[PDB]
Scaffold this motif. Sequence first.
Motif, short mmCIF file in Angstrom:
data_model
loop_
_atom_site.label_atom_id
_atom_site.label_comp_id
_atom_site.label_asym_id
_atom_site.label_seq_id
_atom_site.Cartn_x
_atom_site.Cartn_y
_atom_site.Cartn_z
N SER A 291 6.14 -5.08 13.44
CA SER A 291 4.96 -4.24 13.22
C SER A 291 3.71 -5.07 13.30
N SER B 19 19.48 -11.10 9.68
CA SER B 19 20.85 -11.60 9.68
C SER B 19 21.23 -12.33 10.98
N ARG C 250 12.45 -8.20 9.19
CA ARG C 250 12.23 -8.20 10.61
C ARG C 250 11.41 -7.05 11.13
N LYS D 71 18.32 -15.99 6.34
CA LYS D 71 19.35 -14.97 6.31
C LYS D 71 19.77 -14.45 4.98
N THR E 215 10.17 5.40 4.61
CA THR E 215 10.27 4.15 3.86
C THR E 215 9.42 4.23 2.57
N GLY F 22 10.36 -1.72 3.06
CA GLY F 22 11.16 -1.09 2.02
C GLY F 22 12.40 -1.87 1.62
N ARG F 23 13.21 -2.27 2.58
CA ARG F 23 14.52 -2.95 2.24
C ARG F 23 14.21 -4.26 1.50
N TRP G 273 -3.91 5.96 8.71
CA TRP G 273 -5.09 5.67 7.90
C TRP G 273 -5.83 4.47 8.44
N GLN H 4 14.88 -5.62 -2.72
CA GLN H 4 15.66 -6.81 -3.08
C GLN H 4 14.87 -7.72 -4.00
N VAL I 253 18.04 -13.74 0.61
CA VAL I 253 16.98 -13.85 -0.44
C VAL I 253 16.87 -15.26 -0.98
N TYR J 173 11.26 -5.08 -0.21
CA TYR J 173 10.75 -4.82 -1.52
C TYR J 173 11.83 -4.51 -2.55
N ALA K 209 0.84 -1.20 0.00
CA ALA K 209 0.00 0.00 0.00
C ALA K 209 0.88 1.25 0.00
N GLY L 100 6.95 -6.91 2.35
CA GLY L 100 7.71 -5.75 2.79
C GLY L 100 8.72 -6.01 3.84
N1 LIG Z 1 2.19 0.65 3.55
C1 LIG Z 1 2.67 -0.70 3.37
O1 LIG Z 1 2.35 -1.54 2.47
C2 LIG Z 1 3.78 -1.39 4.17
C3 LIG Z 1 4.13 -2.76 3.96
C4 LIG Z 1 5.17 -3.42 4.67
C5 LIG Z 1 5.86 -2.65 5.58
N2 LIG Z 1 5.54 -1.33 5.73
C6 LIG Z 1 6.30 -0.52 6.65
O2 LIG Z 1 7.70 -0.65 6.26
C7 LIG Z 1 8.48 -0.36 7.42
C8 LIG Z 1 9.59 -1.43 7.51
O3 LIG Z 1 10.44 -1.33 6.33
P1 LIG Z 1 11.97 -1.37 6.58
O4 LIG Z 1 12.73 -1.22 5.25
O5 LIG Z 1 12.36 -0.43 7.75
O6 LIG Z 1 12.24 -2.82 7.22
P2 LIG Z 1 11.95 -4.33 6.69
O7 LIG Z 1 12.19 -4.40 5.26
O8 LIG Z 1 10.66 -4.84 7.29
O9 LIG Z 1 12.98 -5.18 7.62
C9 LIG Z 1 14.43 -4.83 7.47
C10 LIG Z 1 15.18 -5.91 8.23
O10 LIG Z 1 15.00 -7.14 7.52
C11 LIG Z 1 16.20 -7.98 7.60
N3 LIG Z 1 16.65 -8.23 6.23
C12 LIG Z 1 16.22 -7.65 5.10
N4 LIG Z 1 16.85 -8.09 4.03
C13 LIG Z 1 17.77 -9.03 4.48
C14 LIG Z 1 18.73 -9.97 3.80
N5 LIG Z 1 18.88 -9.94 2.47
N6 LIG Z 1 19.37 -10.76 4.67
C15 LIG Z 1 19.17 -10.76 6.01
N7 LIG Z 1 18.31 -9.98 6.71
C16 LIG Z 1 17.59 -9.13 5.94
C17 LIG Z 1 17.16 -7.13 8.39
O11 LIG Z 1 17.02 -7.61 9.71
P3 LIG Z 1 18.32 -7.64 10.78
O12 LIG Z 1 18.57 -6.22 11.10
O13 LIG Z 1 17.86 -8.47 11.85
O14 LIG Z 1 19.42 -8.27 10.04
C18 LIG Z 1 16.70 -5.71 8.23
O15 LIG Z 1 17.12 -4.80 9.25
C19 LIG Z 1 7.50 -0.33 8.61
O16 LIG Z 1 7.22 1.03 8.99
C20 LIG Z 1 6.22 -0.97 8.09
O17 LIG Z 1 5.03 -0.52 8.77
C21 LIG Z 1 4.55 -0.70 5.08
#
Ligand SMILES: NC(=O)c1ccc[n+]([C@@H]2O[C@H](COP(=O)([O-])OP(=O)(O)OC[C@H]3O[C@@H](n4cnc5c(N)ncnc54)[C@H](OP(=O)(O)O)[C@@H]3O)[C@@H](O)[C@H]2O)c1
Length: 159
Positions: A49, A64, A44, A76, A123, A97-98, A22, A102, A78, A100, A7, A95
Motif C-alpha cells: 500500500s 512468511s 506485507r 518471519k 479490516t 489489521g493482522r 479520505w 498480534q 513477531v 495490529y 487511523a 499495521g
Molecule cells: N487506516 C489505517 O491506519 C491503516 C493502517 C495500516 C494499514 N491499513 C490498511 O490495512 C490493510 C492491510 O491490513 P491486512 O490485515 O490486510 O494486512 P497486513 O497486516 O498489512 O499484512 C498481512 C501480511 O503480513 C504478513 N504477516 C503478518 N503477520 C505475520 C507473522 N506473524 N509472520 C509472518 N508474516 C506475517 C503476511 O504476509 P505473507 O502473506 O507474505 O506471509 C500477511 O499476509 C490495508 O488496506 C491498509 O491500507 C490501514
Amino acid sequence: MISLIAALAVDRVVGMENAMPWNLPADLAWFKRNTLNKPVIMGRHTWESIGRPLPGRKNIILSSQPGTDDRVTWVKSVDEAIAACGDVPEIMVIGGGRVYEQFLPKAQKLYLTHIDAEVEGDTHFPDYEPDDWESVFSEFHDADAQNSHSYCFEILERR
Ligand SMILES: NC(=O)c1ccc[n+]([C@@H]2O[C@H](COP(=O)([O-])OP(=O)(O)OC[C@H]3O[C@@H](n4cnc5c(N)ncnc54)[C@H](OP(=O)(O)O)[C@@H]3O)[C@@H](O)[C@H]2O)c1
Ligand SMILES: Nc1nc(=O)c2nc(CNc3ccc(C(=O)N[C@@H](CCC(=O)O)C(=O)O)cc3)cnc2[nH]1
C-alpha cells in the motif's frame, strides 16, 4: 516499549480493498511526527500500500516468504521483528489489521486518530479492553478546506 499507531473510522474500520476514502494531511503529519527516527513494523499488505520505504525510519516488513526488496528488512515472526529493532526506546507498529492484532497484547502505548467517517471496510483495529488502557492526550480538529473529515488524536497508555 512497543506502540501501535492507526487511523480508525467509525466501527474501528482501518482498511478496505482500496485506499481509504479520505484526504487527511494533518493526520499524515501526525503519523510522520510520531514515527520518524523510530523503527516501524508492518505487514506485507501495508508495505504494498505504502509503495516505497518510509524515509528516516528502519522499515521492517513481516512476511512468511523471503523478501522481494533489498532496501528494507524482512522477517518471519513477531519475535524476529522485535529483535531486528535492536535497543531502542520505542518501536512503532504501523499495521495492518493482522499485525495490529498480534502486537496489541505486547504494546504499552496507542496513538489513535478517530475519524468521523462511515466506510464499509474489511479490516479493523483490534478491540482494546477499557480496563487495560488509560487515555493521556486528546485533541479534536474539525473538517476544513484541507481535511475531508473531523479527526481526534488520542494517546493511550497501558495499565
Ligand atoms: N487506516 C489505517 O491506519 C491503516 C493502517 C495500516 C494499514 N491499513 C490498511 O490495512 C490493510 C492491510 O491490513 P491486512 O490485515 O490486510 O494486512 P497486513 O497486516 O498489512 O499484512 C498481512 C501480511 O503480513 C504478513 N504477516 C503478518 N503477520 C505475520 C507473522 N506473524 N509472520 C509472518 N508474516 C506475517 C503476511 O504476509 P505473507 O502473506 O507474505 O506471509 C500477511 O499476509 C490495508 O488496506 C491498509 O491500507 C490501514
Ligand atoms: N494515524 C495514522 N494515519 C495513517 O494514515 C496511517 N496509515 C498507516 C499505513 N499507511 C500509510 C500510508 C502512507 C504513508 C505515508 O506516505 N507517509 C508519509 C507522510 C505523508 C505526507 O507527508 O504526505 C511519511 O513520511 O510518514 C504512511 C502510512 C498506518 N498508520 C496510520 N496512522
